[PDB]
């Protein structure tokens, strides 16, 4: 079938949904594409290359809140951004595993530079803004991975029994959203402290 970049990526994401990340292979992608392996190789050199591009394309396609709205507070941007990042990661099977270990791609440079600049224009040092952004990313990544990998892997004392009912009660959104608010407020307390002991 068609082997332009967009079509290869479409097929790969469809396969990711079928197999998950551990089970995704270039051999299986070739089969899905109706092509022989040396044909695939011309287009896609190895699994790493493919995973690198899926991480980028999952966000380009589905991570819609990458930029602050005009006038938006930094707290609100981080909140919407995290929510959007989470949704994009959850969209495909093992999506968070796909993102892990990537670094920003050149096609994301201007976006991510805008995010870092925006934090600094709101009073953060570059370093502190980066810490806040990285904490949001790590927290969101952790939460999504816990959920998705929990699913992959698939006598109690009373408080643990209950905690597990609680967790078995929703998809992880409630705990994520509550933690996110805590994270943001801690950042704010830090920012507003300046050089005061806090």
Residues binding a copy of itself (CB under 8 A): 22, 48, 52, 100-104, 106, 109-110, 112-113, 116-117, 120, 126-128, 130-132, 134-135, 137-143, 145-146, 149-153, 155-160, 162-164, 166-167, 174-176, 178-179, 181-187, 189-190
Cα-flanking dihedrals φ and ψ of residue 59, to 5°? Answer: -70, -40
| Residue 88, C-beta contacts closer than 8 angstroms, at least 6 positions apart | 58, 59, 61, 62, 63, 95
Instruction: Check if the beta carbon of residue 94 is closer than 8 Å to that of residue 21.
Output: yes
Residues binding ligand TAC (CB under 6 A): 59, 63, 66, 81, 85, 103-104, 108, 111-112, 115-116, 133, 136-137, 163-164, 167
Residue 81 contact partner, candidates Cl ion, ligand TAC, a copy of itself, none, CB within 5 to 8 A by sort of partner: ligand TAC
Residue 4 contact partner, candidates ligand TAC, a copy of itself, Cl ion, none, CB within 5 to 8 A by sort of partner: Cl ion
What angle in degrees, to the nearest 10, is found between the helix axes of 5-19 and 47-62?
100
Q: How far is it, in rounded angstroms, from Cα 57 to Cα 195?
A: 41
Instruction: Check if the beta carbon of residue 9 is closer than 8 Å to that of residue 26.
Output: no
Determine, following the binding rule CB under 5 A, whether residue 115 of this chain makes contact with Cl ion. no
Determine, following the binding rule CB under 5 A, whether residue 26 of this chain makes contact with Cl ion. yes
CB closer to ligand TAC, 112 vs 152:
112
The token pair that represents 73 in the structure block: 């507070």
| Residue 121, C-beta contacts closer than 8 angstroms, at least 6 positions apart | none
Residue 143 contact partner, candidates a copy of itself, ligand TAC, Cl ion, none, CB within 5 to 8 A by sort of partner: a copy of itself
- Output the known binding site for tetracycline: 63, 81
């Amino acid at each position: 079938s068609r082997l332009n970049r967009e079509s290869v990526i479409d097929a790969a994401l469809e396969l990711l949904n079928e197999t998950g990340i551990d089970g995704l292979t270039t051999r299986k992608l070739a089969q899905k594409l109706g092509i022989e392996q040396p044909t695939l190789y011309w287009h896609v050199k190895n699994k790493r290359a493919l995973l690198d591009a899926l991480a980028v394309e999952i966000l380009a396609r589905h991570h819609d809140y990458s930029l602050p709205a005009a006038g938006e507070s930094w707290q609100s941007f981080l909140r919407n951004n995290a929510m959007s990042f989470r949704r994009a990661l959850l969209r495909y099977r093992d999506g968070a595993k796909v993102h892990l270990g990537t670094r920003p791609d050149e096609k994301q440079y201007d976006t991510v530079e805008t995010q870092l600049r925006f934090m600094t224009e709101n009073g953060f040092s570059l370093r502190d803004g980066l810490y806040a952004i990285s904490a949001v990313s790590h927290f969101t990544l952790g939460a999504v991975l816990a959920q998705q990998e929990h699913t992959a892997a698939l006598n109690l004392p009373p408080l643990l029994r209950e905690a597990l009912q609680i967790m078995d009660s929703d998809d992880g959104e409630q705990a994520f959203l509550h933690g996110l608010e805590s994270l943001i407020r801690g950042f704010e307390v830090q920012l507003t402290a300046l050089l005061q002991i806090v």
